[model samples]
Target: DEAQFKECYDTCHKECSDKGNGFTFCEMKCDTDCSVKDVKEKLENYKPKN
Candidate 1:
């Protein structure tokens, strides 16, 4: 799901860029603060059914 997270992050970045913000400005805006921790927690909490 890390790939999915990267896709989400990239999407956020693109959206911000499309708004004409600087790259670092977009980065600051798009950063969710807990992104890595949030993804890791979600992955840990995922349950697969057989």
Candidate 2:
């Protein structure tokens, strides 16, 4: 399950990076905000510090 989570998160991170946006879903919109949160929270297990 952990491996699956990592793979999914990695894929999402890569996709987000490709979007060329300086801010990420989690960074801009956290668990409260629905804007970026939708994108970032989709990954669920992204290994970002913040």
Candidate 3:
């Protein structure tokens, strides 16, 4: 579960980095705002049969 969560967060973070114009500062903001929240939401909604 933890690995799954980490993977989800990493994927979400990369998406933000790409979505935010792929800039360092923009990616930082995206990481803090978009990715973190989105990843948490994904984790919350995840239904792993474990």
Which structure among the candidates has the greatest TM-score? 1
When superposed on Cα atoms, how far off is each prediction in RMSD? 11.2, 16.2, 12.7
lDDT of all predictions, in order shown? Answer: 0.73, 0.50, 0.58
By the lDDT metric, which is better: model 1 or model 3? 1
* Sort order, lDDT high to low: 1, 3, 2
Greater TM-score among 1 and 2 belongs to 1
Estimate, for each residue in 7-49, the C-alpha lDDT of model 3 and write its tens digit.
Answer: 6556666776676565566545645653345444344366679
For lDDT, candidate 1 versus 2, the one ahead is 1
Error of 3 at 8 (Å): 0.4
Clash totals for all candidate models? 0, 0, 0
Query: Candidate 1: minimum summed lDDT over ten consecutive residues — where?
Result: 33-42
Scored by lDDT, model 2 comes in at 0.50
Best of the candidates, lDDT? 1
Task: Locate the minimum summed-lDDT window of 10 residues in model 3.
Answer: 34-43
Using alpha carbons, what is the TM-score of model 3?
0.37
